[PDB]
């Protein structure tokens, strides 16, 4: 729109306009430094974001999903436009945040926190190993023997259009094991620390999702700080019910931070 | 010429191929071929030194009249070297050119291939041996010596007004009856200004050892592709215009291509396996584009490194940034270039040649050749020679010097190749062991200037640096190393020395001389320059090599010799 175009423009006229470190801003060059090491995990400052334009604190929680998407789109359209040399290897991006003036302990988050901006910590426990999932929907026709084609995918929902090279026909189908896009996976099970309990009873816990960029960093019993966001499996079997819906809650990680972080770590001041 | 003299060559001979060199083997195996062709049996030889040579001739105390040595000659009036030579035919073909005149003259037992645009040393014999002062080859007024000796009628003859020749001026006395000696020394010394310009200030190399030999055997109708490659090897050794000069590169682009391209024995049917006739392409002296990944071989050459300074981290940062603009993947930067995928490994040099124009390197690309035997793989221009130098493997068995020579000459066949990969491997491990010392010595600040030069000394023996080729290579990586980054622009131009321990040889503290930066044609003082201190104090020095730039001392008899050799 007129205004709904200006989101990406604000990012563009942010990353090379809001400048500190005595000139020659990070996000002028920090993105270059991300492309250099082949990471694709650029991270953003909420502090600096508010120091530029406060506006995108309220325009986030109504759908932080679309905020993050409309950001990383800008990272591509900048990178491959100025670094078309990049356009072989990965050519896909998403960004992170590390400034949220809040720690929500566990046993603190409830129905108001639904599907919006979050922070919390805890302790790791046993979880899964290393697996991928899918990323794109494509099958194979057999009435005409064609491909159904690739189809636009919703987060956990079916598509099934009639349009396809088989005279837009062939309701039935089969599926291949290739020509389709993949995505690593790993899980976590988060517990709360033995210091900040309610002083003597059993503790609480909920589970957390990490994604293909995010695996083989955690371990059982490790130190941590994560933004994450509040999930909802939208149906853990609604019907003629219990005395209670069998619902659950997860957090999906955007930016995980280790609070030990025993590697060579810090950025550089300019001088 | 020997389109006439070669027709002398049928009887017995001895073909000696003087101390280790790539000119040597390439120039000689062809002639071994030639000479078992016209049904001659002959003798090839390893040379361990001028004493090895002299005992060798001693062991061949026959009258083999067609004696042959190649890539040597400037040692003596070698009739003085080789007395029993009476009219024996020798042949010199050396590119160590600053050679004596008594070897040139005496048109008896030598081959004056005197052909050069320098007509500068014509009376160089017409006064040193032809004139003399205060001499005994003369007569006296008494009647007991009333015989005419070898009267040159010059200073070589008497100086007491007895000189029938020397008819330029007066007889009895110019200003005195012995002003003969005065003018003798006038010319003697005023033109030792030019004699000492020869052989006592500087040395160099000249031309090929064996491209002349290619043209020789070309006139007998031989299109031996492999002989083109062997001579290519002989030149690409010291094609290294920084090591020892080619010069003619942009002229041999006409010469050798004209030898080989114009005569196209098959213009339409050559798409075959065996020895599909040689090609030519413009590529690098990047070490070993082919069988290694980038990121190690982008790191051990000096010229790629010194201009971008990688033995510290920051060079790697800018390196990665230029891989960035290149957009090479790091994995791909750590798989062998051939082990890469296709399109990158095709377009690699295609891009690098033009967008390295803009970032601190200009002088990496060259003009050279390459070819297949078959379908195994596509060998490279120099990866023989850098496999060769790794065969100078001075093991303590005492046979391995000459044996490694014999092995090497048995290598460049199309047959023996299981060893050639061996040479590659040995070469690589040494090549990054080179780098392994530079960081240690630079940042330990071992760059001893000690006055008018830079200077190195080392402490114990490495099998790398037992022998001196590796030693010159050490000196010729550090030098650029240090002088890039520790200096202002004033003092980047001074020469270099380097000790070389030999724990093997009871303690001798070997040395090699090497020159300051970026003066290709202005070459070594050290044709003689070290010998100053040899005169001044003088202690157990050697000059055994026909290579000039080398000595061999005691373990510890150098430092005071050096303090004398300050100047």
Swiss-Prot record, chain A:
Cell location: Nucleus; Chromosome
Post-translational modification: Phosphorylated by the catalytic component of the Dbf4-dependent kinase (DDK) complex Cdc7.
Source domain of life: Eukaryota
Zinc finger (C4-type): 141-167
Subunit architecture: Component of the Mcm2-7 complex. The complex forms a toroidal hexameric ring with the proposed subunit order Mcm2-Mcm6-Mcm4-Mcm7-Mcm3-Mcm5. Interacts with Mcm10.
Primary role: Acts as a component of the MCM2-7 complex (MCM complex) which is the replicative helicase essential for 'once per cell cycle' DNA replication initiation and elongation in eukaryotic cells. Core component of CDC45-MCM-GINS (CMG) helicase, the molecular machine that unwinds template DNA during replication, and around which the replisome is built.
Any further remark recorded for this protein: Early fractionation of eukaryotic MCM proteins yielded a variety of dimeric, trimeric and tetrameric complexes with unclear biological significance. Specifically a MCM467 subcomplex is shown to have in vitro helicase activity which is inhibited by the MCM2 subunit. The MCM2-7 hexamer is the proposed physiological active complex.
Protein name per Swiss-Prot or TrEMBL: DNA replication licensing factor Mcm2
């Amino acid at each position: 729109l007129g205004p709904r175009t200006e989101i990406a423009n604000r990012f563009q006229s942010f990353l090379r306009t809001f400048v500190d470190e005595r000139g020659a801003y990070t996000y002028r060059d920090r993105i270059r430094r991300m492309c250099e090491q082949n990471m694709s995990s650029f991270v953003v400052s909420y502090t600096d974001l508010a120091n530029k334009e406060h506006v995108l604190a309220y325009f986030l929680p109504e759908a932080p999903f679309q905020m993050l998407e409309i950001f990383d789109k800008v990272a591509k359209d900048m990178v491959l436009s100025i670094f078309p040399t990049y356009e072989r290897v990965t050519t896909e991006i998403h960004v992170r945040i590390s400034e949220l003036p809040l720690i929500e302990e566990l046993r603190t988050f409830r129905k108001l926190h639904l599907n919006q901006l979050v922070r919390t910590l805890g302790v790791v426990t046993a979880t899964t190993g290393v697996l991928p999932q899918l990323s794109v929907i494509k099958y194979d026709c057999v009435k005409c023997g064609y491909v159904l084609g690739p189809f636009v995918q919703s987060q956990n929902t079916e598509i099934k259009p009639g349009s396809c090279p088989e005279c837009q026909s062939t309701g039935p189908f089969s599926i291949n094991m290739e020509q389709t896009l993949y995505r690593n996976y790993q899980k976590i099970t988060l517990q709360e620390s033995p210091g900040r309990i309610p002083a003597g009873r059993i503790p609480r816990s909920k589970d957390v999702i990490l994604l293909a960029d995010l695996c083989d960093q955690c371990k059982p019993g490790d130190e941590l700080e994560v933004t994450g966001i509040y999930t909802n499996n939208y149906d853990g079997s609604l019907n003629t019910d219990q005395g209670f819906p069998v619902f659950a809650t997860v957090i999906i990680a955007n930016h995980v931070v280790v609070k030990d972080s025993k590697q060579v770590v810090q950025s550089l001041t300019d001088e | 010429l020997r389109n006439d003299f070669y027709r002398q060559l049928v009887g017995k001979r001895i073909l000696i191929v003087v101390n280790y060199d790539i000119d040597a083997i390439c120039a000689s195996r062809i002639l071994q071929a030639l000479f078992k062709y016209d049904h001659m049996l002959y003798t090839v030889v390893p040379i361990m030194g001028v004493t090895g040579l002299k005992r060798a001739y001693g062991e061949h105390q026959g009258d083999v009249k067609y004696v042959v040595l190649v890539n040597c000659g400037g040692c003596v009036d070698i009739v003085e070297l080789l007395q029993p030579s009476d009219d024996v035919t020798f042949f010199i073909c050396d590119s160590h050119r600053p050679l004596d005149v008594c070897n040139i003259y005496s048109d008896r037992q030598v081959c004056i291939l005197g052909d050069a645009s320098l007509e500068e040393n014509i009376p160089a014999f017409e006064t040193i041996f032809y004139d003399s002062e205060g001499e005994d080859e003369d007569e006296d007024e008494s009647s007991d010596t009333e015989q005419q000796h070898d009267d040159s009628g010059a200073g070589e003859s008497d100086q007491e007004d007895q000189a029938p020749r020397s008819r330029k001026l007066s007889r009895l006395e110019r200003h005195e009856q012995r002003i003969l000696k005065q003018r003798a020394r006038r010319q003697w010394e005023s033109e030792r200004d030019r004699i000492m310009f020869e052989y006592t200030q500087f040395s160099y190399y000249g031309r090929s050892a064996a491209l002349m030999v290619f043209e020789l055997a070309w006139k007998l109708s031989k299109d031996n592709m492999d002989l083109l490659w062997w001579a290519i090897v002989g030149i690409t050794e010291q094609l290294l215009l920084g090591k020892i000069e080619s010069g003619a590169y942009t002229l041999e682009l006409e010469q050798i291509q004209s030898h080989v391209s114009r005569l196209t024995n098959k213009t339409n049917d050559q798409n075959t396996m065996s020895a599909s006739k040689i090609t030519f392409e413009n590529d690098l002296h990047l070490v070993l584009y082919r069988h290694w990944p980038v990121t190690e071989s982008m790191r051990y050459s000096r010229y790629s490194s010194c201009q971008l300074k990688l033995w510290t981290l920051r060079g790697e940062k800018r390196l990665h940034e230029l891989l960035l603009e290149m957009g090479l993947p790091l994995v791909h930067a750590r798989q062998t270039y051939g082990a890469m995928d296709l399109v990158l490994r095709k377009e690699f040099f295609s891009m690098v040649e033009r967008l390295a124009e803009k970032y601190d390197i200009a002088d990496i690309v060259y003009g050279t050749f390459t070819l297949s035997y078959g379908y195994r793989s596509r060998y490279a221009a120099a990866d023989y020679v850098y496999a060769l130098l790794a065969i100078m493997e001075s093991v303590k068995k005492h046979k391995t010097p000459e044996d490694c020579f014999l092995e090497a000459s048995d290598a460049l066949s199309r047959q023996h190749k299981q060893l050639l990969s061996a040479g590659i491997d040995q070469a690589k491990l040494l090549h990054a062991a080179v780098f392994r010392q530079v960081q240690s010595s630079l940042e330990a600040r071992q760059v001893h200037s000690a006055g008018s030069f830079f200077y190195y000394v080392l402490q114990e023996e490495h099998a790398f640096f037992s022998y001196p080729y590796a030693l010159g290579l050490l000196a010729r990586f550090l030098l650029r190393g240090h002088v890039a980054t520790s200096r202002a622009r004033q003092a980047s131009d001074l020469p270099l020395i380097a000790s070389c321990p030999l724990n093997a040889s009871e303690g001798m503290c070997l040395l090699v001389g090497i020159v300051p930066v970026r003066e290709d044609s202005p070459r070594n003082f050290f044709g003689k320059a070290f010998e100053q201190a040899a005169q001044k104090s003088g202690v157990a020095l050697l000059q055994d090599f026909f290579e000039p730039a080398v000595v061999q001392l005691r373990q510890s008899d150098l430092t005071r010799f050096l303090d004398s050799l300050t100047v």
